[PDB]
C-alpha cells in the first residue's frame, strides 16, 4: 500500500485480496403447524362453534 510504499519498496504481490464477511448457515428451520394464531389475539377461538 501507499503508506508502506513510503515506508519500504515493493516487488510484485503474491496475492491481492480484500476484506470479506464471515457468517453462519441457518441449517434448517421449523415449519408449522406449531403456531398459526400469530396475527390474532390468543383469547378468542371456540366461541363461533
Amino acid at each position: 500500500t501507499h503508506v508502506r510504499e513510503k515506508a519500504i519498496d515493493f516487488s510484485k504481490p503474491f496475492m491481492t485480496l480484500g476484506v470479506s464477511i464471515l457468517y453462519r448457515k441457518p441449517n434448517g428451520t421449523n415449519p408449522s403447524v406449531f403456531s398459526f394464531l400469530n396475527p390474532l389475539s390468543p383469547d378468542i377461538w371456540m366461541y363461533v362453534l
Binding site: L40, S41, D43, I44, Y47
Partner: peptide, 22 residues
Amino acid sequence: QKIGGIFIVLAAGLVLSVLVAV
C-alpha cells in the same frame, strides 16, 4: 381490543325471534 366482544347482535336477533313471543 378489536378482537373480542362482538357476538351480541345474533343473540339479540334470537331475543327478537324467541324472546319476542313468550
